[model samples]
Target: GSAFCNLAACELSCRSLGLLGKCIGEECKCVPY
Candidate 1:
């Protein structure tokens, strides 16, 4: 049950970034709200 929440959060994050045209830098960006 708890894992589902984590998965959902990551999924939403990826989707949000996908809308942002993807990261162009080499460094990984933190998920900032």
Candidate 2:
């Protein structure tokens, strides 16, 4: 889960920059990394 944390954080940050959080959903939860 640690790896996921880093990855998710990055993705969230990037998406948030473009105000795209609403477009993302549960599928963004993360893969089994």
Candidate 3:
């Protein structure tokens, strides 16, 4: 199965590589590094 996170909780797509900080739901939070 795909390791995609909960879309309902966060609408932003997470890249495979980055600083690990992105938008989550409606607040500015990290997507877990």
Best by lDDT: 3
**Cα lDDT for residue 14, candidate 1:** 65
Q: Please give the lDDT score at residue 13 for candidate 3.
A: 36
lDDT of all predictions, in order shown?
Answer: 0.39, 0.41, 0.46
The C-alpha stretches of model 2 lying farther than 4 A from their native spots are 1-5, 18-33
Listed in order, each prediction's TM-score against the native is 0.27, 0.26, 0.23
In angstroms, the error of model 3 at 22 is 1.1
- What is the TM-score (0 to 1) of candidate 3? 0.23
Ranking by lDDT: 3, 2, 1
Q: Write one digit per residue (lDDT tens) for candidate 3, span 1-33.
A: 335446444434334345344543445455655
Q: What stretches of model 3 exceed 4 Å from their correct place?
A: 1-19, 24-26
1-33: candidate 1 lDDT, tens digit per residue: 122234443455466565322232332233444
Runs with alpha carbons beyond 4 Å of true place in candidate 1: 1-5, 16-33
Candidate 2 per-residue lDDT, tens place, 1-33, comes to 212234455467556455432213333442322
Worst 10 residues of 2 by lDDT: 21-30
Task: Look at candidate 3 and give me any clashing residue pairs.
Answer: none
Say which candidate scores most in TM-score. Answer: 1
TM-score of 2: 0.26
